[model samples]
Target: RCCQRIFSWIPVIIISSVVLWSYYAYVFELCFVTNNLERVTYLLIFHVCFIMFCWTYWKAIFTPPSTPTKKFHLSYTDKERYRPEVQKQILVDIAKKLPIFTRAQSGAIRFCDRCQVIKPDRCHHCSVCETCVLKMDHHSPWVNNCVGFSNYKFFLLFLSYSMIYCVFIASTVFQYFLKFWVGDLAKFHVLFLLFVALMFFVSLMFLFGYHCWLVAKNRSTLEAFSPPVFQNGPDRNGFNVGLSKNLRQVFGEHKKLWFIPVFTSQGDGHYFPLRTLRESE
Candidate 1:
């Protein structure tokens, strides 16, 4: 219970500190140490990365990933629980409550005994949030929020920008790092920051690449790692229309805005266009 209250602030404080330290290191090393105020390129890169990092981080943590609401209970009638056709139609009606789309079929729809709500195909119960989350990816203590259908785009941007930021710092400070290691104790602090950036880069690269694959394939971290079983068979991502469509689900329809960190999922968090859109017909 205590963890639930403090979990969301961890990433907030951590990334804030990182950004502050990066700013301090960049200014001190360039202006004070080398007296190189003419390095506009480095400063520009830092500013761009810093802005993107801060915006995406803020959007990712603050935006509430859409969830199932009290209205969900209105559609929870069990009169047609056994028919695939009936279940599919029921799911279509259920989706009217939320606007996000997906292809996970409803032949095996479930109920949340705790929340007293019927859960859609990709929805999962999040204990920390004390509710069932629609298309929940995972609960991230770092961001202090559950990753869900709504803010996933911003989360991706946060990770993507963070990796790029770390790479920039590590690459820019490499020569100085070697000097400090060899014996230049005066450069120790800059070298220390370089090592930190390098470590972050190594891990974030893999994490960023992994999520890119997931977005292209139309999968949540939970669905990709441990796919839920359905009544018929494994939900083989049948809703995945293609790479472009899958990417559009998390990002927005506008290609120009795809790179921006904003709450721009193509639809509301409930109903999504799926490959099964025509399957029932």
Candidate 2:
């Protein structure tokens, strides 16, 4: 199990490292070979921004839930059985509430006879964490962590940064493609370009799709299974909210979301809320 988890992260680390190093190399080449300091500066700025984003995002997603407060701990247990009528009522109430995020239909909320906790909406018991995670997304092997409610924003940021990084790298590579092709493109180098381009296009599509889905319904990947409520019309609640709102939600309001504090007055485990609805007034 441990090995499997570690293995999952290998690809992420490898891909990201390659991307970062390649960007640095490209910038250096631009400055020294091309003598285009302006272009190099732009690339440098993007690199810094992307690195900052990834760092902050990783911190937010993986930081353990603070102090075992109500938010961090489950309020109910499952050891004691509720009356059948009560169980029905609970389900009904949850259904009526029009969950801010959707619940997984295939993933039923089981009443644990042993745990005695009434698992909240979107909560799932994680074998690795040894606890139920609210709005539990899949455990990410790359980060070697679970993407749950606390870390959902960070997970999204990771994807966003990765997409941007790929775009910048691809752009830089394309700009010099002619030089490489004409200047003696080795078979290996050509293959490498092909691979990077393929991955770049795929990553961009996946990021765009997932990001749009998140913004349209005000939900995360895990919460995508709940039934849609009919507000003005059928599926009205699921309509996309446009790019501006989506950008605001992902990047955050104060720009604080993009940087992780090394030491701070806020202490730790506090992520700049990436979702607008979840942000504090």
Candidate 3:
């Protein structure tokens, strides 16, 4: 119980810290060192915009529902139950609860009959989380949380905001080094350049790979395992199908489904529930 509580709140803390650090790093370079109002203002404005975007997106993605609790079933046995029929039945049952978008139908969501309840959509069941995630993505140690649907968007936004802030700071820092610190062009610190280059390379790969594989594919890391679904399925239609369709399905039919307050009532008395769980004995 203690572990569950800790993990549930982990994403909140991790996201907040990332946002704070990115903002502070940009501010330090802008205020103390750059002394360039235009650059400083640009950085400030961009950070503000990014923050707003993150807040809006996060709220939309994780809005609390009228029902805050969901129940899942787990079957325990003294012996291992590893049989082909058992595995197939487990997978089929999982498919029923998950939104049957083409991606999932193609075999994106896997099941372990022993432990029931659809996973977080990219989360593999941790002995901790105890259920399969929709995407079954990897567990992240830094955040001390499973990078599942609830927090995946925020994670990506965190990376994007960090990259933007880092690039801006690196640019200003370079200028400062040239004007105030470096008397000779040849004396520029090679080590610093190497460090900056490494950072840039890493950030680029993370940003590009995430956007292409996860965001573009409309999948999380866990869903990546079901490659046959997205790679050569009948739904593969040049970005017109597959991922695009999956995105549409997730957002639902109403245009406002993507933007409106579906999860909670805003004086209109209309409430939306994002997930529902059922168990069979």
RMSD of each: 5.4, 7.0, 9.3
Runs in model 1 lying further than 4 Å from the true structure: 1-4, 31-38, 69-71, 74-108, 178-185, 276-281
TM-score of each: 0.79, 0.61, 0.51
Q: Write the per-residue lDDT of candidate 1 for residues 118-215, one digit (tens) a residue.
A: 67657888988778888898888878888888778888889989988887778767755555567653655677788889888888888889888888
**Residue 225, model 1, lDDT:** 74
lDDT of 3: 0.46
Order the numbered candidates by lDDT, best leading. Answer: 1, 2, 3
Ranking by TM-score: 1, 2, 3
Task: Encode model 2's per-residue lDDT on 1-281: one tens digit a residue.
Answer: 88876776786687567766666565565324433677667867776866765685566545653222233333454564446767656644654533323223333334333333345544566666656665565566556667665665666656666666666656656656655667833224634654675696687677668756775555545446543333222242342345555455444555664434232222123122223234346
Which lDDT values do the candidates have, in the order given? 0.72, 0.52, 0.46
How badly does each model clash, as a count of residue pairs?
11, 8, 16
For residue 165, model 2's alpha carbon misses the true position, in angstroms, by 1.0
